[PDB]
Design a binder for this molecule. Structure first.
Ligand SMILES: Cn1ncc(C(=O)N2CCOCC2)c1C(=O)Nc1ccn2cc(-c3ccccc3)nc2c1
Ligand SMILES: [Mg+2]
Ligand SMILES: [Zn+2]
Length: 314
């Protein structure tokens, strides 16, 4: 066999939840294959088909500040850390499906929200009335899988292929943050009444949904310098969208208005309190070994509070 290896520092640090994949774009495909080989197995995929698939996915991400190829591999790495620290809890098909779902989950993103596509009257909004971009990301995933020499699931039976594509579809749709609020509330009630049952497929779907949110938002779980610099890329996109809202004659929401730049630290505090902390809190309740995501999120909350008090500059 030809086994994938990483340099000593990457081999050690890739196992940490707060790993950053670095600025060398040409190393990310190898980092992804390494993670697939360790979390799934060296026999899960034909290396030639997987490599061809990876390079086609990369080509269908756009040169946008945040929703780019680096984001796809970063979200895949957070899923790798969750799977490796909870290895007894997931099925063979879920391992095969979830790293692929993460790599593909923002395919052909143009850096605009579902709200903007609706207000613009983009053709995608007519095709997909809810979770507009997320239905598009899944459609793009299916298109790539159906290219000649790209069927990475070719050894699966018809029924197994259908199951893994359903795992991928549900996981990608769950990254619509509008759906997260309802999903987390249901999981919180299920955990607190002790009704949560991982033998129940409808419950497994919700747990995978929350895992996808946790991976998608994982910038808030990095070390402070990574968290702060990633926020710059997020706002680059938000403020471009705000500009486009103003061109349509619509007042943008505060987070999309570049003239409100000085309110970002208080905006971050609001986001950590309303979304991030509850997300990682509920995930740690269901999957205790994901504790390091919540610890790092609480640490960054404390950093944004220091910025607000004028002890940190951003
Ligand atoms: C870090 N992080 N990681 C992922 C995401 C995220 O939400 N994504 C989904 C949309 O696609 C990008 C990722 C964020 C984030 O910063 N969210 C937010 C959420 C709400 N806000 C309100 C304000 C704000 C308010 C008033 C004035 C100025 C700013 N600023 C924010 C930032
Ligand atoms: Mg998305
Ligand atoms: Zn994303």
């Amino acid at each position: 066999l030809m086994q994938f290896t990483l340099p000593v520092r990457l081999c050690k640090e890739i196992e940490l939840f707060h790993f950053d994949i670095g600025p060398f774009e040409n190393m990310w495909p190898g980092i992804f294959v390494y993670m697939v080989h360790r979390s799934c197995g060296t026999s899960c995929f034909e290396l030639e088909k997987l490599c061809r698939f990876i390079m086609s996915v990369k080509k269908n991400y756009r040169r946008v500040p945040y929703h780019n190829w680096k984001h796809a591999v970063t979200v895949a790495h957070c899923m790798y850390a969750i799977l490796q620290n909870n290895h007894t809890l997931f099925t063979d098909l879920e391992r095969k499906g979830l790293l692929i779902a993460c790599l593909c989950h923002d395919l052909d993103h143009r850096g605009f929200s579902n709200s903007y596509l609706q207000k613009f009257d983009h053709p995608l909004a007519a095709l997909y009335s809810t979770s507009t971009m997320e239905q598009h990301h899944f459609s793009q995933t299916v298109s790539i899988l159906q290219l000649e020499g790209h069927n990475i699931f070719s050894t699966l039976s018809s029924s197994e292929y259908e199951q893994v594509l359903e795992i991928i579809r549900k996981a990608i749709i769950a990254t619509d943050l509008a759906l997260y609020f309802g999903n987390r509330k249901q999981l919180e009630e299920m955990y607190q009444t002790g009704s949560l049952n991982l033998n129940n497929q409808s419950h497994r779907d919700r747990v995978i949904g929350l895992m996808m949110t946790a991976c998608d938002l994982c910038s808030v779980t990095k070390l402070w310098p990574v968290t702060k610099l990633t926020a710059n890329d997020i706002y680059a996109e938000f403020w471009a969208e705000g500009d486009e809202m103003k061109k349509l004659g619509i007042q943008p929401i505060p987070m999309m208005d570049r003239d409100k730049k000085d309110e970002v630290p208080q905006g971050q505090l609001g986001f950590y309190n309303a979304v991030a902390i509850p997300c990682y809190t509920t995930l740690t309740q269901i999957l205790p070994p994901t504790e390091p995501l919540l610890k790092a999120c609480r640490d960054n909350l404390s950093q944004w509070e220091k910025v607000i008090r004028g002890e940190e500059t951003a």
